[PDB]
Design a protein around this ligand. Sequence first.
Ligand SMILES: Nc1ncnc2c1ncn2[C@@H]1O[C@H](COP(=O)(O)O)[C@@H](O)[C@H]1O
Ligand SMILES: [Cl-]
Length: 401
Amino acid sequence: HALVPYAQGKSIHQLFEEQAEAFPDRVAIVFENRRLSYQELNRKANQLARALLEKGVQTDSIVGVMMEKSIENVIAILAVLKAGGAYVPIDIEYPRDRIQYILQDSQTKIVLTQKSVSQLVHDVGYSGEVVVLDEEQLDARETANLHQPSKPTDLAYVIYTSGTTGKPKGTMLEHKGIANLQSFFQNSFGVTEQDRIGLFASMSFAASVSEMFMALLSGASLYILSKQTIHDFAAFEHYLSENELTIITLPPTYLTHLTPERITSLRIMITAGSASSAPLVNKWKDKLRYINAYGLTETSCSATIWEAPSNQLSVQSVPIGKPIQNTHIYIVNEDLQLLPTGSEGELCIGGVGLARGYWNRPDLTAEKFVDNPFVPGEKMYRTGDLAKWLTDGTIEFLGRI
Ligand SMILES: Nc1ncnc2c1ncn2[C@@H]1O[C@H](COP(=O)(O)O)[C@@H](O)[C@H]1O
Ligand SMILES: [Cl-]
């Protein structure tokens, strides 16, 4: 039994199926002028999951996804999880050679795409199975849940990232971190089925996975923001306002361009990926609940939060806060010795959100995902981030070691 309760023993798609059973007629997903209910979304994913099972998708199958941000991309993701596999979202705007390297590194034998992306799949020369989902004839297939065997330690998704230099690498994420996040978001952000959540991040990026499941594992609605909507700050404000969106996660670099008087309905603004200035926090923290979230691809996108304390004077600095439920974080020196208040060292993260490691990168995995000496038999991730404890028990982010 976990320190903080969550839906232990459950896969991502099982938690989604429970929401589709409880809230069948609520709106699940919106893109432009189209929307699906939970029941509609679940049925379509089950029809596709049975097709993918017939093609050989099984536990720890890595299934490439080369698709636009769309309702059909979400159907594909849910279908891969229900068939028992794991998906790798491939950024279709990347140069050809980067897509080629990712597909080759991943060793994926099956890629899901759409008609508008088929020519790119041909041009990067992929020689495995290609499923053109908007040519697939699925309407006759059974719409019931599959109930395939699954364990929360099974792979769910693989996210590729490239450093300044270094080859793209795949971070392997299991279901368990996203199951814990469902509990975290309900407890700490009060997410309910009433919420209307924007999908901002590229569906290549680990943050997108977090955003998508923030909605779909609570019965809330997910509004997939279009390229045009994100590109124009006025259009972005109008879209949020007209659709009464209640929660969004943004890079602070984007939030900087927005006008609080132009967003009607948000109850929470989360910023992630980089630091928010104190002036940016002061501009927003009395209009809504401002949350600074610190987390990594390697930790299921989550580690710590700092919600700006409500009804307070201005702040002159912006902590990254405290570890979230069922996660551990340590500030250590180069010898992995714990540091007292005020001493800067490396953030190391442990607990349920930790990736399995890097795909086919055993020495890098061993270097980064080290034995947790504080909790025998667990691992912890060496972030490369510098931080210190404040004596109030919050963490200050200081940059890179
Ligand atoms: N709230 C934050 N404040 C400052 N840096 C952050 C924050 N959240 C994420 N980061 C940085 O982004 C990295 C994770 O990048 P990624 O895995 O691409 O999400 C972390 O190791 C930090 O360097
Ligand atoms: Cl089940």
